[PDB]
Design a protein around this ligand. Structure first.
Ligand code: HEM
Ligand code: HEM
Ligand code: HEM
Ligand code: HEM
Lengths: 146, 141, 141, 146
């Protein structure tokens, strides 16, 4: 989406250093933890009673990795997110029924987790580019709601 | 609404920021102007360039305002009435901008207090910033 | 925080609604579904077809709680208490959705109450609504 | 702007009956009463102290006509809003410094005024087309904000 090169390159590099197992698990974790209502969709995951049971649940982790993976796929089709997440959108509205307002939270939580990972390197301008990727993603998953 | 564990992690999280509250108030504002430019409409009379003095200074007014809010965590409305009548009637900042300043605050803390930013502290800081926010937007008409 | 005048308006406005409220509460629900499909996410178990009896009967249940909220104008926070848990605890409905339904009652009301929906009244009912939406959303955490 | 022809025709058809001189007035007028803080943009309009001062204020009535014109003119260009409103967005951003959030309010206050003129004629389906249109307009207006 309306992405500058100096921007499209910033996101990329940083991303290549991302430890997907670690980052993806912590995001999905902080969502269940920071916004408890989300837990209602993941009931089949098991114990999510305490924060410490959230960040350690093998199901949360495996799933987080999978989310990150698709986030990963989107930084490749940045000029065409609509088409990439079309299928997952349906999935999220028709089967899973999640209010697309929730997508924004995960994305923000993603921006908190990265900056927690990188400190200095995740500069204000690096943050702004990801702010765009993350919104683009959220829009893209909302597109096929009907 | 803050429960004691929250207050307890806020106080603790905050108190750590410690003598850097100031620096984080700026990193955060700066981050907000950049990531979310619409918010810049509220600061036309400012020079919003990288590392500039209005933000530096305006940065410590905010973080200090947070600090005071922490100290009175148990009674924020009385503690902020002034700031409230300013963001609600003199400037009348639309609430949505608060969610943004809050997000950016968490990112600055998150990037600086790595050991301290737990999923419980994240959560508490968020419930906290959410309350500061609500108190500064209580008479929006 | 409602005013003595705001109340008077809400009251005389809802007072015209009268028996025709389920009607309005249903037409509103329906105006929300077609205009803001996201909101159907909370109603996976309803028949949202144009004319559905489920919807209609629900519109009576919403329209009532409002009537009740009116009836307890000076104690909404407690009057509507069962409703706060439900929409906040049980269902966790994200607030933007309350801004939306509120926007549809307004429209609706506006479409049935020509002479009643004056600027002054449009201001109050909007104020009353933000309030109902504020209470039903509060126990979020 | 994703507007089916059914929505297209439904939109215009109605717009054709709209008294612009009037609707323009009522809309900014309500905007200004239902959301008082916005008045902080028009102090040049003389008395705004009460709902009658406002609704009747000639400068409110003159300015709203202007608003609508721009609208009438976006509806004549549903497929190029961003461009149609490109100059107006710059102005609202650079010259007048208006939070784009206020655009959504005007739009929704507009939709409300239409329902007040037309009644049962502003059926749900018609409202939906309009909701799509005012949202489109608001985004176009927020597009060149930098
Ligand atoms: C932020 C953007 C998001 C992306 C990119 C994403 C991605 C995914 C993906 C890829 C899947 C698996 C699809 C497949 O079957 O191959 C999935 C499953 C799921 N997602 Fe999302 N998600 C996002 C946000 C959310 C939100 C915020 C929630 C709820 C708050 C959610 C709820 C779910 C649920 C309930 C499943 C089913 C998992 C299972 O089979 O156990 N997603 N998600
Ligand atoms: C937690 C959130 C916030 C806190 C704690 C806070 C605190 C403060 C403080 C302490 C001041 C200085 C008041 C004085 O000098 O007496 C101020 C002013 C101001 N705030 Fe906020 N603020 C917050 C959020 C925001 C938001 C989100 C915006 C809009 C984007 C905003 C816009 C302004 C503006 C324009 C001023 C006036 C600055 C000037 O003209 O010098 N504030 N705020
Ligand atoms: C003006 C604000 C609202 C009021 C006064 C209101 C009122 C009600 C009432 C009276 C009930 C039924 C309680 C019962 O069955 O005993 C209810 C349930 C429900 N509400 Fe709300 N509501 C409001 C807004 C919303 C909105 C914004 C949403 C989400 C878009 C929503 C979603 C639901 C759902 C899904 C149910 C339960 C359906 C069922 O399982 O039977 N409500 N609400
Ligand atoms: C659909 C949304 C809107 C549209 C199409 C719109 C359109 C316009 C137009 C056509 C003008 C005249 C342009 C000019 O003077 O060169 C204008 C001026 C202006 N607009 Fe907007 N506007 C919208 C929303 C807003 C709102 C939300 C605000 C703030 C509350 C606002 C504030 C102003 C102001 C202050 C002027 C200059 C008034 C004066 O000094 O005479 N507009 N706008």
């Amino acid at each position: 989406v309306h992405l500058t090169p100096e921007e499209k390159s910033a996101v990329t590099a940083l991303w290549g250093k991302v430890n997907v197992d670690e980052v993806g698990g912590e995001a999905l974790g902080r969502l269940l933890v920071v916004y408890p209502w989300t837990q209602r969709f993941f009931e089949s995951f098991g114990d999510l009673s305490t924060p410490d049971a959230v960040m350690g649940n093998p199901k949360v982790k495996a799933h987080g990795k999978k989310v990150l993976g698709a986030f990963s796929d989107g930084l490749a089709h940045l000029d065409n997110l609509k088409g990439t997440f079309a299928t997952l959108s349906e999935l999220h509205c028709d089967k899973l029924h999640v209010d697309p307002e929730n997508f924004r939270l995960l994305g923000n939580v993603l921006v908190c987790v990265l900056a927690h990972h990188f400190g200095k390197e995740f500069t204000p301008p690096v943050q702004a580019a990801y702010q765009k990727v993350v919104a683009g993603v959220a829009n893209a998953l909302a597109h096929k709601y009907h | 609404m803050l429960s004691p564990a929250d207050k307890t992690n806020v106080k603790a999280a905050w108190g750590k920021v410690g003598a850097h509250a100031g620096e984080y108030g700026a990193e955060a504002l700066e981050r907000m102007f950049l990531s979310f430019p619409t918010t810049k409409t509220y600061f036309p009379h400012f020079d919003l360039s990288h590392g500039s003095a209005q933000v530096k200074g305006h940065g410590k007014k905010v973080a200090d305002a947070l600090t005071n809010a922490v100290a009175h965590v148990d009674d924020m409305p009385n503690a902020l009435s002034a700031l409230s009548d300013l963001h609600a009637h003199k400037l009348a900042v639309d609430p949505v901008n608060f969610k943004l300043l809050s997000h950016c605050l968490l990112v600055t803390l998150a990037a600086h207090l790595p050991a301290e930013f737990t999923p419980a502290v994240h959560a508490s800081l968020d419930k906290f910033l959410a309350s500061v926010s609500t108190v500064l937007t209580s008479k929006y008409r």
